[PDB]
Amino acid sequence: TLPPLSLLDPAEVKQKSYSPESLEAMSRLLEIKLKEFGVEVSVDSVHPGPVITRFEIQPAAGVKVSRISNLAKDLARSLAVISVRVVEVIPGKTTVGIEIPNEDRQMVRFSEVLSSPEYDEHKSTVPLALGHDIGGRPIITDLAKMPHLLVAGTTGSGKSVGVNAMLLSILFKSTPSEARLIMIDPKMLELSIYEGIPHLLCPVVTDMKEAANALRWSVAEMERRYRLMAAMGVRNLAGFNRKVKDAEEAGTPLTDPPQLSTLPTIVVVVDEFADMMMIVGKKVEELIARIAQKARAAGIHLILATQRPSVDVITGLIKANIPTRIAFQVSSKIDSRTILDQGGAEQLLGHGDMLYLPPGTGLPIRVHGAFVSDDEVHRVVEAWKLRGAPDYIEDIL
Amino acid sequence: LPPLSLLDPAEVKQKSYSPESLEAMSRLLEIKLKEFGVEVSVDSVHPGPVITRFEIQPAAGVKVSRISNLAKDLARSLAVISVRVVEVIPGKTTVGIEIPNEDRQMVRFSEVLSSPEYDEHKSTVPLALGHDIGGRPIITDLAKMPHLLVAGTTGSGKSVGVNAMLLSILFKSTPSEARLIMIDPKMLELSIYEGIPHLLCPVVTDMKEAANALRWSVAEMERRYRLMAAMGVRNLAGFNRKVKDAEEAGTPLTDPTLPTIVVVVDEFADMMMIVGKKVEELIARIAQKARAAGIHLILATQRPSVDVITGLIKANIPTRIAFQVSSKIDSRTILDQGGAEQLLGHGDMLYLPPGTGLPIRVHGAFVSDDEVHRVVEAWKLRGAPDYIEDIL
Amino acid sequence: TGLIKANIPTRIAFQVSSKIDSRTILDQGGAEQLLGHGDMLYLPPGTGLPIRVHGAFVSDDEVHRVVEAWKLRGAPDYIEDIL
DNA sequence: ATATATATATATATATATAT
DNA sequence: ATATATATATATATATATAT
Ligand SMILES: Nc1ncnc2c1ncn2[C@@H]1O[C@H](COP(=O)(O)OP(=O)(O)O)[C@@H](O)[C@H]1O
Ligand SMILES: Nc1ncnc2c1ncn2[C@@H]1O[C@H](COP(=O)(O)OP(=O)(O)O)[C@@H](O)[C@H]1O
Ligand SMILES: Nc1ncnc2c1ncn2[C@@H]1O[C@H](COP(=O)(O)OP(=O)(O)O)[C@@H](O)[C@H]1O
Ligand SMILES: [Mg+2]
C-alpha cells in the first residue's frame, strides 16, 4: 500500500539547454583567463549538467593543480560567475575538472530522482535519494551500510530540505515492518509536519527531558536486539531477517529466547544537534556515542543534521564513528574540514548543493540535493496517516 | 495614526560630490594603487550617503587578495579612516573598493519612513533601520526575523538605533495589532516611553520586576499557542482571520483580535546579571514558539561578551545586527564573519538576514530625542495607556 | 572580573608588567609600553583609541599641606550608621 | 616564480586550580 | 573525592611575507 509517486510535483525545469557554440566560446574564454594567470590549459571535454558544467581541462606540462585551486576565486571573479569549483582529481581520467555554474539554474525536483532505476530496484529497507549528480545521473545511497550521517552547512543552504528528501526516501520505499523512525527536533520548524505517520515511535521530540529517554530506549533496544540475535546464531540484522523469512518459508515461527517476525530498521534523526547539546549536554553525549559505536549490526541508524560541527558540539568519539558526511555550504576551508576532512565545501552554491562523501573514500561526490517544498511533505504525510494509525510506544519515554 | 508631518523634514543638501571630484578621486585611487604593486583601472563610480563605492577593473593577473591586503595602506595613502574591499560584486568582473566620504550626510528618519516600502509593508512590526550603501532604504519585517540581536561597543548609535526601531514599530500600528513591554535596566534609555497605549505595564525598570514580565510573556505565548489549536490555526494572523471575518459574516466565535506583543529588551546584560539564570534560560524558552503567537524580542546589549550573548540565547535568534564594536573578538560573538569592528561608527551596522550569510552594509537612521518626545506625546494624545496587574 | 569591566567604561592603566594585564584592563594591549613613573594611557568614557596622558606628580609633603588647609576650615563629620 | 619563515585556527593530551 | 575550566605543548592545515 505504498503511496503513489504521483503525489510529487512533476518534472518541469527540463527546458534548459545550451548550444555548443556557447560552450566553445566559454571554453576559449576559460583558457584565456587562465593563461592570463600564468597557468595555461587546454579544455578537453565540456561535460554539461543541470546546475554546473564541468569544463574538463587538461593542464600543461609542469603546472601543478594547486596553481589552479589557489585562484579558484580570481578565475570566478574574472568569468562573471559566482564561484567555480576545481575538481582537482577526476577518478579514472587524467584531467582537472573546473565546474563553472550555469546562468539559469535548472532546478531538481524529487519525482525526477525517485523515478530512476537505481531507486526502483534498490533492495535496502532504508535508501536515500540524495539527488542528481553533476550530469543528471541520479545519486541514490543506502543508509543501512552508510551507516550514519552528518548534515552540515551554514544557514540557508538546504539542510532541512536535505533531511526532508532523506525522510521521503525512507517513506516511499519502506513499510512500518521494514523501517521505523525516531525524530528529535529542537527549534521545531520543519520536522513537526511528519507527526502522525505509522513509522514513528514518539511525538516530534521537543521535550528535551524526553529526548534523553528516547535515546536511552534506543540504546536499550540495541542491547535487546543484540541479545536476541546472538541467541539465534546470526551476525547482523540482515542475516536475522534472512533466518526469520526462511522460517516463515517452512511455516514455522521460531522461538523467542513463542513467535518472532521480521524486525524494523530504526532511524534516529536529530536536527540541529548544537541546540540539543546546548540543553542536554553531557547527559546525552555518551548516549549518542554509544548508539553510534555499536549500532550498525542491529539497525539503529543515526542521522545528525547540524550547523558547523566542531568538537565543541559533536565530540571526536562520535565523529570518529560517523564516516559518511555531507556538506551543503561551509564558509571557509576550516568549516569545510570540520565536516568533511577536506576543502572545497566552501566552493559551492546554496539552495541544496551538497558534497556527498561515501564511506571510506577521499573524493566527495558532488550531488545536487533534490528540492522538496513543504506542500510535497504535507501531501505525503497526510496520505500516510490515511494508511496507518499513529502507533506510538510510550514505554520509550 | 501620528502622521508623517511630525518628524524633522530632511534638510536639503545640494550634494557632497561633483563629477570632477569623483573623476579626481578615481584618478587618485588608480595612481595610489599604481604606486603599490597592483595595476588598476576604475570604470564606474557609485556614490552614497556615507560610503562611496569604486568598482575597479584589475589588470590581467591581478589577484584580489593583493588589493584586499593593500586595503589598509590605501586607507593611509588616501587620507581616510579605512576602506573595505568588496572582493566580488555579483554578475560583474570588477572588484569594489568602498571609500568613506569627507562630508558625511545624516540618514534622517523621515527620509526612511517616507520611502515607498514602509508605506506598502504588509506587517505590523517593520524595523525601518535606514539606508544602505546605494542610498536605498533597508526595511525588514520583525515577524519574519523573528527576533533580534542588536549589539555594539558603547557610542555606536545603538540607543538611537533601537529608538528608531521602536519608532518604526510604533508609527504604523495601533494597540489592537502591536503592543510593547519594555525593559530598560540602566535607568538611561527608553525611560521616555511612559504614556503610550502600546505598553502593557509601567516600563519594567526594576530588574527583579523583569522576571515577572518575562514569565507573563512565556505564559502568554504558551496560552496563545493552545488557543491556536483550539481553532486549528497556526499563526496569529490565522487566529485573526476568524475574528476579522467574524465581522464580515457576523460570527459569535468566542473563547474555547489578539495583538502582536514585542518585548522590547534593551541592554540585557544588566537584566542577566541582576537576575541570573531564570532570565538566561527564559528567552531561549520564549523564542521557540513566540514566532507564531505575536511575541517578539529586540534583544540589545552594549557589551557583546561570551557570557552575555550565550549559545543558549544566541542560537534561538539568527537575526543579528552589529555596530562599531571593539575588535574581532566581539565581532565573532555578535556576528560570524570578519569586519564588524572596522565600521565608520555613528550608526553604521552590518544587518545579517535570517536565511543568509552575507551581512548587508547598512547606514542607521538618526532620530532626535526631541522628535522622540514629540511622537511619544502624540501617541499619548491620540489615545490613553492601559496596563495589566499580574505583570508585576 | 566581568562584573568590574561590565559597567566601568572609563579605565586608567599605568605601566603593567605584561600584555595579558594590558588586555585585562583596556582590551587593547598598549599599556605595557609605558615609561613608568606616573605614565598612563587614558581610555576615555565611551570607547575609542586610548589617549596617552602623562600623569602629574604630587608629593606627600603637599597632600599633607592641603589636608591641613582643609582641616583648619572644617571637622570630621562621620555619619554613625555608615559603618 | 618558487622554496622557506612567521603568524593563526582546530583538535588532542596533560597539569593545575576551582567548584559540587 | 569527583567533574569542569584554563593554560600549554604539539601536531596538522592555511595564508602572507621574505630569500634565491
Ligand atoms: N534542492 C533545492 N533547490 C533549490 N532551492 C533549495 C533546495 N533545497 C533548499 N533550497 C532553498 O533553501 C532554503 C532552505 O534552507 P534550510 O535547509 O532551511 O537552511 P537552514 O536550515 O540552514 O536555514 C529554502 O528557502 C529553499 O528555497
Ligand atoms: N545615524 C547617525 N547620524 C548622526 N549621528 C549619530 C548616528 N548614530 C549615532 N549618532 C551619534 O552617536 C550617539 C549615539 O551613541 P550610542 O551608540 O547610543 O551610545 P551607547 O552605545 O553608549 O548607547 C548619538 O548621540 C549621535 O550623536
Ligand atoms: N609625574 C611624575 N613624574 C615622574 N615620576 C613620578 C610622577 N608621578 C609619580 N612619579 C613616581 O612615582 C613614585 C611613587 O609611586 P608609588 O606610590 O610607589 O606607587 P605604588 O604606591 O602604586 O606602588 C615616586 O617615586 C615618583 O618618582
Ligand atoms: Mg533549517
Swiss-Prot record, chain A:
Residues at which ATP binds: 156-161, 351, 369-370
UniProt-annotated location(s): Cell inner membrane
Stretches assigned to the Cytoplasmic side: 1-397
Domain named FtsK: residues: 136-337
Assembly: Homohexamer. Forms a ring that surrounds DNA.
Its biological purpose: Essential cell division protein that coordinates cell division and chromosome segregation. The N-terminus is involved in assembly of the cell-division machinery. The C-terminus functions as a DNA motor that moves dsDNA in an ATP-dependent manner towards the dif recombination site, which is located within the replication terminus region. Translocation stops specifically at Xer-dif sites, where FtsK interacts with the Xer recombinase, allowing activation of chromosome unlinking by recombination. FtsK orienting polar sequences (KOPS) guide the direction of DNA translocation.
Family statement: Belongs to the FtsK/SpoIIIE/SftA family.
Domain comment quoted from the record: Consists of an N-terminal domain, which is sufficient for the localization to the septal ring and is required for cell division, followed by a linker domain, and a C-terminal domain, which forms the translocation motor involved in chromosome segregation. The C-terminal domain can be further subdivided into alpha, beta and gamma subdomains. The alpha and beta subdomains multimerise to produce a hexameric ring, contain the nucleotide binding motif and form the DNA pump.
Protein name, entry field: DNA translocase FtsK
Organism: Pseudomonas aeruginosa (strain ATCC 15692 / DSM 22644 / CIP 104116 / JCM 14847 / LMG 12228 / 1C / PRS 101 / PAO1)
Name of the gene: ftsK
